[PDB]
Design an enzyme around this catalytic site. Structure first.
Site, PDB file in Angstrom:
ATOM      1  N   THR A   1      42.632  37.394  37.317  1.00 16.97           N
ATOM      2  CA  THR A   1      43.322  36.781  36.189  1.00 16.97           C
ATOM      3  C   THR A   1      43.168  37.637  34.937  1.00 16.97           C
ATOM      4  O   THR A   1      42.067  38.064  34.598  1.00 16.97           O
ATOM      5  CB  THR A   1      42.792  35.359  35.910  1.00 16.97           C
ATOM      6  OG1 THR A   1      43.146  34.495  36.997  1.00 16.97           O
ATOM      7  CG2 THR A   1      43.384  34.806  34.622  1.00 16.97           C
ATOM      8  N   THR A   2      44.283  37.895  34.254  1.00 14.13           N
ATOM      9  CA  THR A   2      44.278  38.694  33.035  1.00 14.13           C
ATOM     10  C   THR A   2      45.260  38.093  32.043  1.00 14.13           C
ATOM     11  O   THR A   2      46.462  38.033  32.319  1.00 14.13           O
ATOM     12  CB  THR A   2      44.640  40.154  33.324  1.00 14.13           C
ATOM     13  OG1 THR A   2      43.821  40.652  34.389  1.00 14.13           O
ATOM     14  CG2 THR A   2      44.424  41.007  32.089  1.00 14.13           C
TER      15      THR A   2
ATOM     16  N   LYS B   1      50.494  30.923  34.189  1.00 15.62           N
ATOM     17  CA  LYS B   1      49.308  30.909  33.349  1.00 15.62           C
ATOM     18  C   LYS B   1      49.622  30.958  31.860  1.00 15.62           C
ATOM     19  O   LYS B   1      48.691  30.943  31.046  1.00 15.62           O
ATOM     20  CB  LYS B   1      48.381  32.077  33.718  1.00 15.62           C
ATOM     21  CG  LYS B   1      47.845  32.000  35.140  1.00 15.62           C
ATOM     22  CD  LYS B   1      46.902  33.144  35.455  1.00 15.62           C
ATOM     23  CE  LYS B   1      47.182  33.712  36.838  1.00 15.62           C
ATOM     24  NZ  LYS B   1      46.177  34.733  37.239  1.00 15.62           N
TER      25      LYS B   1
ATOM     26  N   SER C   1      39.001  38.078  34.527  1.00 15.80           N
ATOM     27  CA  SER C   1      38.221  39.147  35.143  1.00 15.80           C
ATOM     28  C   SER C   1      38.739  40.527  34.754  1.00 15.80           C
ATOM     29  O   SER C   1      37.960  41.482  34.676  1.00 15.80           O
ATOM     30  CB  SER C   1      38.223  38.989  36.664  1.00 15.80           C
ATOM     31  OG  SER C   1      39.540  38.836  37.161  1.00 15.80           O
TER      32      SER C   1
ATOM     33  N   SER D   1      43.541  40.260  39.802  1.00 16.75           N
ATOM     34  CA  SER D   1      44.776  40.226  39.035  1.00 16.75           C
ATOM     35  C   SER D   1      45.892  40.922  39.802  1.00 16.75           C
ATOM     36  O   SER D   1      45.644  41.806  40.626  1.00 16.75           O
ATOM     37  CB  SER D   1      44.594  40.886  37.664  1.00 16.75           C
ATOM     38  OG  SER D   1      43.437  40.399  37.011  1.00 16.75           O
TER      39      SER D   1
END
Lengths: 202, 202, 202, 202, 202, 202, 202, 202, 202, 202
Positions: free
Chosen positions: F1-2, F33, F129, F169
């Site tokens: 996830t970014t 997101k 992350s 990601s």
């Protein structure tokens, strides 16, 4: 597992059952737990099967070698003392066993030995999960004045009571009688089967 | 994993399945779990694959070496005794295996040996996760008077029941028949496939 | 503990054994594990005795109250659904039981319910420590075309195999037969004793 | 356990297997894991049986009540949103389930919801222990341009691959097809059996 | 990490990806996981990089030394047996690796070996976190009758599916083809790049 | 996830990727997101999907209700303060999320809020992350004097670097631009795809 | 701690910072983390200071001894292989270090070695707590076509970004350039100080 | 602690010993463990003294209140059912007791109840640490045809055996006889002392 | 277990009981805990039976060997010093024993030695679980001016009090008297039995 | 701590010492542990000081209130029953105390109550760390026929023995005598000091 050993005036009587539990559940009904290790010496085994079988082979070799060099049978107390030393030497990596040793050198003896090597003489003793039920029968019925035939009936009754109350015990009953006049005699299965019918234990 | 070994009048029948689980999930469908280790001796393996395969190679070397020096085959009880000593010697760093040894020296024998070295003889025995289902079939259908052909059908039916109820077992069934007159004979896959159709186990 | 329930064309057969272990060891030989909870509904209990007996009393009250208000018997699927809700509501402080529910509303049903409330219908099912041995017998011998008499023999044979291999099971076998024409009928002990002699299970 | 749901141009296809493991081992071969919860909505369940069955009954009541008050079917996204709220509200005492929701309000949708209430839309999704094998089949063969018949074949092939490699999955394959023109249609077992023969998956 | 090895009529095909994770996160994109260890033998490595690289150097030395003394290549089964012994000898302080060994002595073989030394032959096998996705592709598309060119396409498609679903796998695909007529041939990167364009895997 | 959010002279730029990991492995490639929660306010979510989605629905309801009663949009600092209170109230049973809130009341703001409710304003911030890789790009290339077009290119480059190094990601990049003159504008996918080709990030 | 090593057409560039934390807190600002170990070989150290310094002395002795006996410099791959063997031999009592080895035997190489002995070649690599920030800079700005002067600027910018975001890194930047024509050249502090002013990193 | 209860043709016999261990060691020799709770109902207590005494007071109040309202004595099965409900309601914060309830409503009954509320009827039962020794005596000597005088002798002998083998049991033996014709009669200490002399148990 | 040793003007009196607990419960009533190890030296043992019996055999061999070489008896303090060294040498793998050593070299001595080898002289000492009750009797009744006959009565009374309050102690009392004029004399059982009748301890 | 209570023909004698340990070490030499709670009732306290003092205040209030309403003193057994209920109600969050209650309603009684509420009557009892030494003195010297003066001497001697052997006990001895003719009389310190000189306990 239920093993019993008693002393009489000139005899030693030992008897065990045959049920063996392995990987849980009853996987063997006719295991062997009563061994002759000398001319007038027997041993019963309770606990882990692997450790017990190794010890039986060790005692057979040691007692036979002792007989050849000393030209005499190892005394029963010496048999228990030798077993006590071996078990205590590895007490922190021990054999998970409980043992009974009985026989006649000049008098009948029965010895009880624990995993840590503690050895103590007694007129009668019992080991295994079914032993407390056997002790109840022996506490109320045993007499030092019984004959050999009466003593055989008592151990059959005591083990039969344990089989009724201990799920870990079961199977056919093995009985051995030790005297100086006859040596180590294992009673035939047909005789014990006849005894249970006459005794009323079905 | 499901292995079974039975004794008959002059024969020993052993049979296993082939499913192997590694890193979870079914990664091999045709594993080998039944080995010939002597002229009239077979062994089945359950548990960790790595430990079991090492033991099989050890027994093949020891039994062949024993045959060359003694000019006779190792007795089946001696085979189980040798295995018992090796497993008990490393009981605190043990092989995570359950073993069945069967064969004919002068009579048919089947031996069950656990990880700690406990060895006990039986008329029939089963190991693995699917073994309790096999014991149910054998408890209600086994007879010491069956012929070799009937005994082959029984082990096929018993393993087929285990495959229906044990997810860890599966694959094609391997069967070996041991007699003095024919030696160690592994039944062809085509014959067993024919038997299952005739038996009705699809 | 061994309980079994099977379905036939117009009948439901349920059977359990009687051995109860409490504070370890066999302290009761004639426990009760098969209960009638409605006119055409029975339930078997495995696991903790205290939790199981409470649930039996709960179901008897609920089913009787349901009958009085709705003027009809609770359907078997509704019986399992009600039990599923109660067990799942306390899943984190659960009843440590495994249950079998069988009966006939318009067709025969057998339901298996776990501690977390999972309910699933099956043609036959078995619970308890002796259940895997029963499944082996049922896998190789059950047929949907059997008569009521043949079905009674099968469950007696299956439980007898479990008693030979599971130390936690034992005692006299209780059998109940449910049909629309006769209702809930518990077979007399004398008939089952006769059946075992005729079947050969001693 | 293996469940799969895919989207097509005007259709939703969902399919699961039937193997249920309870108290370990395969105790049920014909469990139910695919449920119709609305006129054009289906749900598949993976995980604990007790929690999953409770949720299915909850959704059936909520969706039917929603239909009666609003005079319209609940939108598929609203169905997933409602499920997400319920699971997240008890996330620290959660339902141990993984869910798939599919249907057509005006377009086909498939939603994947985890135990903590995380909901995300996808063109296709798979749950259970056998899901990674299904994803391999779908990654290399799925196409958004397939017909309904081709899509039915794909899910049958994907689940068949999972049954070969996942021991927790097995049994007969259940398939449901959802369209606006036909509603929720569960494919007959005879048709799927014919398809597997034609497809070559034995 | 994703490695795959398949067998054909007279060929062995092995292929891996290149992504390496160290101290978490993708720190190397072009790692090496496919090694030639003999004239007609290759090995793939999954797990800890340090342990795997040490084993590769060990096998190269042992196989070359074996070739010089015996004047013949080590048989593929002997290669797996040697690896099995080394891993099992240190099973309690083990190499955290999963290995695939493939080659042709007189027939094509592929062997899968776990950390504990369990070795089993298979027609095809896959290791690493991306292996279950590969098994799905192989379960539905592999055929023993494929040509070498078709087999190369299959492993490229299978690894491409794993790269889409396994975050631990990625990078350029390395492919090696082993035949008696050509020996160990590593396919050029330009050819594999051309294949992926022709196959449609972008 | 970014996720990333930056401030410019009169604009706020927010961008995230789409990869979602559930039950391990990449099970969704096109997750959402980045959410619009008010006329000139956006929020990005990192962490547990279930907790994050619940918070998004809560903020949408609260901000809309606040707008109707106060006839004005909630100030960005008030939005972060409200979120801070909710998260800190349950800090010992917390939401496992990391949040970014950005928008324009009279000036551009970006707020970073942790699980315990700690809120702090910054010119730019990144979560997930893959955030440390983004910070490296922003540390060396960000300038407060960039135009909106240049700022869009920077966040695309920063996330592209994170996708190369963070396995958690991946997927397509979503970008939203917030200004007073245009409101909340989500950039079309075709424009971002064109930008990556022009930027050189493949 | 932040170390970086990159490869160019005929050059290797390595650079680290100087901050050392001991007993927590910044107790040394001018530590040494970049060492010359051969004529054309350098090494950077991250992790425990004690283990790293011991390894540096070991490599200096081994490489010098290797040079005297073989009359040639140890190849860079051989340097990494030797380090890999030493670290893997004590993997269960390991050195808590992460190492980078770079140099030119006939081409430029950079090797990354972990604590367990895993060695892998790369065009560029970074270690330490500040490494992920460096990777972000290198992912977006590194080019294999840069000159030596441009490469020196890149590593200075990358470490400067890490110093802004990693509290464990800090201090003056040390840079070494390795070429065949000049050997191992450590850039003077005055030149690097001039570069940072020209680059704009204060 | 040793308690025993047996059933005869028209009588119930209950007997316990008096040794109480508190803070380890024998601190009381004449504790009370046999209580009359109704006109024809008695109860024995084993386990924690505090919990047992509270339950005795509860049962006395409940049974007396039940008698006043219903004008009849509570049936023995109802007494056990009431106790079962109370213990099961607090099973997770339970009374650490084992209880025996005996009496005559129209036939003699003895009930055994565990801590979790499990209640089961038996012809005879024993509780406490000395119970297994009692079961051995009862297994070999109990008969349903004994007279009241013979039954009193049996329980005295059984407890005397337990006192010889269980260190937790000891002290004077208390005996109560329940019949419809005499009600609840506690045997005088002088009579029991006379019996032990006549029986031979010293 | 209860052992006691006291000193008089020219005598040492030692006495123990005989109860032995093994595998819990009273399995031996006539154990041996008082040993003669030299002409004028005795030892009592408390704790693990196996360790204690090994130490007794060790001391008998060492003291006899010391007597043959030095032509004099080992002094009592030297006996305790030798025991102290042996126990302290293995203090981290210790003998779980508590020992009392008493005798006369030129004056009476009693030594108490713990498991770690701590040795200290005292006029009287007691070991075992029943020792604190003995100390109460000795604190209020012991006098250094008592005669040998009075001292024998005191130890009998002290042990009798311990048998009343310590469940781990019991059985017949063994008494030994050591003087220079008579040596080591073990009192006959008939005399001690007479003493208890005269003393009033039943 | 050492407390003792004895019964005589028409008297109750209670006595304690005064040493109090708080935060380890002897911080108070003259604590109070003997309380009068009614006209003819006393209580002694052992264990935690805080819990004991709270209970003393509770009993004083309850007994006084009971006296005012019932116009009679609470019977001693009722006093112990009330204390038993209070302690058992909070057994899982219990008072860490051991209590002795003595007095005369129509006969002398002494009751011992543990932390869990277990209450049992005895002729004499002792609590605290020094109690086992007191029991030794009482076992060998107590007689029910002693006079009040002799009974006072006995408790002084018993506590004096405990002070010699228990480090937790010490200080001046407090003695109270309860009779119907004199009520609750606390013996003056000067009298007890005179008694110890006459008794010889220094």
């Amino acid at each position: 597992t239920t093993t019993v050993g008693i002393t009489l005036k000139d005899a030693v009587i030992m008897a065990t059952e045959r049920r063996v539990t392995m990987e849980n559940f009853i996987m063997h009904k006719n295991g062997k737990k009563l061994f002759q290790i000398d001319t007038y010496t027997g041993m019963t085994i309770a606990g882990l099967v692997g450790d017990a079988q190794v010890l039986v082979r060790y005692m057979k070799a040691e007692l036979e070698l002792y007989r050849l060099q000393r030209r005499v049978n190892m005394p029963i107390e010496a048999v228990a003392t030798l077993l006590s030393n071996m078990l205590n030497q590895v007490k922190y990596m021990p054999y998970m066993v409980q043992l009974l040793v009985g026989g006649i050198d000049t008098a009948p003896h029965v010895f009880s030995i624990d995993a840590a090597g503690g050895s103590v003489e007694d007129i009668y003793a019992s080991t295994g999960s079914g032993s407390p039920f056997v002790y109840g029968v022996l506490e109320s019925q045993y007499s030092e004045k019984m004959t050999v035939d009466e003593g055989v009936d008592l151990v059959i009754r005591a083990i039969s009571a344990a089989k009724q109350r201990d799920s870990a015990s079961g199977g056919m009953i093995d009985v051995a009688v030790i005297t100086r006049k006859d040596g180590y005699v294992q009673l035939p299965t047909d005789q014990i089967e006849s005894r249970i019918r006459k005794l009323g234990l079905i």
